[PDB]
Design a protein around this ligand. Structure first.
Ligand SMILES: O=c1ccc2ncc(=O)n3c2n1C[C@H]3CN1CCC(NCc2cc3c(cn2)OCCC3)CC1
Lengths: 522, 380, 92, 97, 51
């Protein structure tokens, strides 16, 4: 059987592969800014139970678990992702606390996966907080045997804090990191004013942030990037001249290199440029880097100003490099260029939905607990008739039937709100003193112990009942009014900002406009 | 010639076969399960560089394929007149298949015009219900098999004109219902799902109802009331009547209140005229003309009366999916060699595929352009 | 069972109830009453189980951990059968 | 011992070998991965032992000298005879190291 | 002397030091923690044949 087929299968398979790569591989989401690989790794670490206050664990076990259950797509990619998350100089806020050879700026690769020991950090628990409370949806695995959360109930916009750099089949994205405090301030300002302008958001957040400090010069580029979504920005290293008190000689000091710059390759390129006579005013080159900070020493040639040589270096050396800002992500599974305000609004809506679902879950749980406790207290009220009913019934099923069928006296010592004390599925034919039992209630009564008959359990049950009443009342109040929910969100954001505050690292010196505008319009 | 190529005993071309799979993962079991008479396998390593993105007559890494099949020009040496390309069912398999196809297209058009390139179709699903086994290769075939298992001689007992509703009519009804639910799930990207699911049981609507306001008011009131009744989550439903016309042109408007922002959904003449709404109305009328309130269906030794058709369908699917087993092969180096021989390269059981040279279009020109790759994704 | 019921209902503290159970002897009814030996652990002191009978802190804790389902006309025969089976097993 | 602690009996579904290899490397045998995988493949080959112990499924090589597939494709589990080797272990029958 | 051995700034012998450890596992951290004045580390590959 050889059926004749058309060549269109080529284009069909190409479109299928392109769609698959764009949807599930490259482009992250806007609600959490996390790749599916990072998602699976974090979920595996959460299921394994490796907290920050616990001992270290071998990375090979975690890699094997991830390959076996959720990510069966090799081992090199997962290990490289773990190493990237473990490098402090690669992310503004690390997530995986490890110990071992994790590489450095020299370009040296990390050790094998049988030597390092990794574990979760304190901030990582804030990303997947309140997950078991039915806050998100579950997605089946490759063979339909496990569940994967769709999104994580996060509290920090990791897309804006750290960002990512991925490329699709036809698309590409690149987002600079930022500071957490200014993002929280902007979110609070947006909660205050829904109609805030772009100028207000720019005033709240001057510019991006980097794990290594630098000098930002272009402001129109970042302005266009925040306004439209595309733009270019220049990065300049920090350096200065040195003149001794005596005759001495001039010396250039390099305190820091730009973002994603190899130091050994840079030194090799500088040596090659000095050898090729392309650069002048450089005699030799030394190094004084240690565990107290990177320090590069360059000896200035005698009878040289050094400023012209420094400008020639800035023009030629990689110390001055541009940056391809491009904000592209998925909004409903489709690539859409989104600005800052849209991301903030999506984050606020996601947080509102997560809080609402968690509140509904907690309310249902408290309702069930209170409904069980009511029957337990009714059983504790009258005990002797239950004693005779158990002692005279040979079959426990017959005893349960007799308990359910016979009413009770509802003593005065046993006897809240007008409503909201019963589940929704409960039929009005129960709990009309008069009182009736239930098969589940009778089963819970039959599962009691002898220690619950002291002079201390009754007060504990009464206190628990009062606490459940207060809790369900507060939950009904917070579900009825949205201002209380907004205040809770504001308080949580303020608490997170207070717990995870820090200080600025980089510095922005604006000269692209001071040199241009004041010399063109005067 | 040495290393990877493993020819057969026969040397006369047009009688042997050639294959191209992953070397260490697949070729091992392929050679352990092949024949030693007219079988030949040429392993591969990773991917192959593109022709259009970097065209260079000197650029070559493997060169083994073209050197072993022809001399690279081809009319002289036509060895291995029949070639078959086995490839995994994943997305990377489709990608490497596309690269191989465009390679053989842009290198030797004559071998493709004469009908020599073939494509294999390995299975995808392995369903085993105790003794009953089944090999399924497609998603639609899997869905049809699931529907067939879920309807193993069911017999519905309602209070309609048919005392025992069963046969092919019930199967066709379930198929139409599944197709309509798929269409609703596809259109859900535009409109919410609650109203689309509720319009199944709601009465019909006609453009002649725009005269009387009482009828539209009663209809929207019943709709909002039933939506509030069925609403078990944290949401509400409100109605709205607006007149944007010369005299009436009555247009209902539904106001829903989600977590923090309200949203309206007006109804226009285009929505009523649309074919999707017409199909929904026809299905709703067909289902209301059944009187499926008191139903009794059994599959196959137990029955349970319900109040919803979709609930009974879900119960039947759950009862059919109790003790079945499904094995999905995501790679050629996963199954046994004898299973591969019997299901993929069995000359009496295989199902190959032929490629044609019908038209010469500029699809390959837009394959790598950075503009065609950006304008082509119009899947909306 | 009834004296245990009064002892639990009148004792506010469960520790005091356990102490009262351990300190007070029992009547050892006729319906309650094996081998001459090999029915007791090696670490058990001969001052317990001399009718006359005394309890133990572990025994009293196990007694306080009982449920209401063990008071049917079916649990007694099951306990007797299990005791006979344990006797046969330890003898073998 | 790792296969017994993991709980992979003969009457259960198959499991990926990479998980078992990683577990053995993490807890008990931290001496590489190649030796453990080669030992598993040797135990999985029928033509290498009179009585096999690890029932697997996949490309396990043959007499032609072809090596087995990667550790991300095969699926292994204990056999009926393997349970007789470690029978009555939790009853304090041997010493612990 | 390609790649592997990274000498120090000083060229006069009897002042520098030489080390021999495993390449990929040890030499990385060894170079990341050493000094750049009188330190030199030569990686190794597995074992060495007997004499
Ligand atoms: O494939 C090749 C080809 C050539 C080659 N040359 C040098 C070299 O170092 N390597 C070369 N290679 C590759 C790599 C060696 N390779 C062996 C397998 C190892 N596997 C890592 C691993 C995987 C798993 C582990 C542990 N370790 O436990 C959990 C389950 C999965 C990675 C390194």
């Amino acid at each position: 059987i050889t059926p004749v087929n058309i060549e269109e299968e080529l284009k069909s398979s190409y479109l299928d592969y392109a769609m698959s790569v764009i949807v599930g591989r490259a482009l992250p989401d806007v609600r959490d800014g996390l790749k599916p690989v990072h998602r699976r790794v974090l979920y595996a670490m959460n299921v394994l139970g490796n907290d920050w206050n616990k001992a270290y664990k071998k990375s090979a076990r975690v890699v094997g678990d991830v390959i076996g259950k959720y990510h069966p797509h090799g081992d090199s990619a997962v290990y490289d992702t773990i190493v990237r998350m473990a490098q402090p100089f690669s992310l503004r806020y690390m997530l995986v606390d490890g110990q071992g050879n994790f590489g450095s700026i020299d370009g040296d690769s990390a050790a094998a996966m049988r030597y390092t020991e990794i574990r979760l950090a304190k901030i990582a628990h804030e990303l997947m907080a309140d997950l078991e409370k039915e806050t998100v949806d579950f997605v089946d695995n490759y063979d339909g045997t496990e569940k994967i959360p769709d999104v994580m109930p996060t509290k920090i916009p990791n897309l804006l804090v750290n960002g990512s750099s991925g490329i699709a089949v036809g698309m590409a994205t690149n987002i600079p990191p930022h500071n957490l405090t200014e993002v929280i301030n902007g979110c609070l300002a947006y909660i205050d004013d829904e109609d805030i302008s772009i100028e207000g958001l720019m005033e709240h957040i001057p510019g991006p942030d980097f794990p290594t400090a630098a000098i930002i010069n272009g402001r129109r580029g970042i302005e266009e990037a925040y306004r439209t979504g595309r733009g270019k920005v220049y990065i300049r290293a920090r350096a200065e001249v040195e003149v001794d008190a005596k005759t001495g000689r001039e010396t250039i000091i390099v305190h820091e290199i730009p973002y994603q710059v190899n130091k050994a390759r840079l030194i090799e390129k500088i040596a090659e440029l000095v050898k090729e006579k392309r650069v002048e005013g450089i005699s030799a080159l030394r190094d004084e880097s240690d565990k107290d900070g990177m320090r590069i020493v360059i000896e200035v040639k005698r009878d040289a100003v050094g400023e012209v040589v420094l400008n020639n270096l800035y023009s030629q050396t990689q110390l001055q490099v541009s940056f391809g800002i491009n904000m592209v992500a998925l909004h409903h599974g489709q690539p859409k260029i989104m600005n800052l305000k849209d991301i903030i609004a999506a984050f606020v809506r996601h947080r509102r939905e997560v809080v609402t679902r968690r509140t509904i879950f907690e309310l249902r749980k408290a309702r069930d607990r209170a409904h069980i406790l009511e029957a337990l207290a009714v059983a504790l009220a009258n005990i002797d008739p239950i004693i005779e009913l158990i002692r005279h019934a040979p079959t426990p099923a017959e005893a349960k039937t007799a308990l359910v069928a016979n009413p009770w006296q509802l003593g005065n010592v046993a006897a809240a709100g007008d409503d909201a004390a019963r589940p929704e599925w409960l039929e009005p034919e129960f709990g009309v003193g008069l009182y009736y039992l239930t098969e589940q209630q009778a089963q819970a009564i039959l599962d009691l112990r002898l220690q619950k008959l002291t002079g201390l359990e009754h007060e504990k049950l009464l206190d628990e009942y009062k606490e459940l009443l207060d809790q369900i009342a507060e939950l009904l109040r917070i579900l009825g009014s949205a201002d209380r929910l907004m205040e809770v969100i504001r308080e949580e954001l303020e608490l997170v900002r207070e717990q995870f505050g820090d200080k600025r690292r980089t510095e922005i010196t604006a000269n692209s406009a001071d040199i241009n505008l004041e010399d063109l319009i005067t | 010639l040495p290393g990877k190529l493993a020819d057969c005993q026969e040397r006369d071309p047009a009688l042997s076969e050639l294959y191209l799979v992953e070397g260490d993962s697949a070729g091992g079991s392929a050679k352990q399960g092949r024949n030693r008479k007219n079988q030949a396998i040429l392993p591969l390593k990773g991917k192959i560089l593109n022709v259009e993105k970097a065209r260079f007559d000197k650029m070559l890494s493997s060169q083994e394929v073209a050197t072993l099949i022809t001399a690279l020009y081809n009319p002289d040496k036509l060895r291995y007149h029949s070639i078959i390309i086995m490839t995994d069912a994943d997305v990377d398999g489709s990608h490497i298949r596309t690269l191989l196809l465009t390679f053989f297209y842009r290198q030797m058009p004559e071998i493709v015009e004469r009908g020599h390139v073939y494509i294999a179709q390995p299975p995808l699903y392995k369903v085993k219900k105790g003794k009953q086994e089944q090999y399924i290769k497609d998603d639609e075939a899997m869905d049809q098999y699931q529907i067939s298992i879920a309807l193993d001689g069911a017999t519905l007992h309602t209070n309609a004109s048919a005392p025992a509703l069963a046969g092919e009519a019930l199967e066709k009804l379930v198929s139409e219902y599944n197709a309509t639910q798929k269409m609703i799930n596809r259109m859900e990207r535009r409109y919410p799902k609650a109203m689309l699911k509720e319009l199944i049981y709601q009465p019909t609507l006609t453009e002649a109802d725009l005269s009387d306001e009482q009828t539209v008011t009663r209809w929207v009131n019943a709709l909002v009331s039933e939506l509030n009744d069925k609403e078990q989550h944290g949401s509400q439903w409100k109605f709205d009547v607006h007149t944007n016309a010369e005299q009436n042109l009555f247009e209902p408007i539904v106001r829903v209140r989600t977590h923090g922002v309200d949203t309206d959904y007006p109804l226009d003449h285009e929505f009523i005229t649309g074919g999707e709404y017409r199909r929904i109305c026809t299905l709703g009328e067909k289902l209301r003309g059944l009187l499926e309130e008191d139903a009794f269906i059994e599959r196959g030794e137990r029955r349970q009366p319900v109040a919803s058709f979709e609930q009974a369908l879900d119960w039947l699917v759950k009862e059919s999916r109790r003790g079945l087993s499904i094995q999905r092969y995501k790679g050629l180096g996963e199954m046994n060699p004898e299973q591969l021989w019997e299901t993929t390269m069995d000359p009496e059981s295989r199902r190959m595929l032929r490629v044609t040279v019908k038209d010469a279009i500029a699809a390959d020109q837009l394959f790598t352009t950075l503009m065609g790759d950006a304008v082509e994704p119009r899947r909306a």
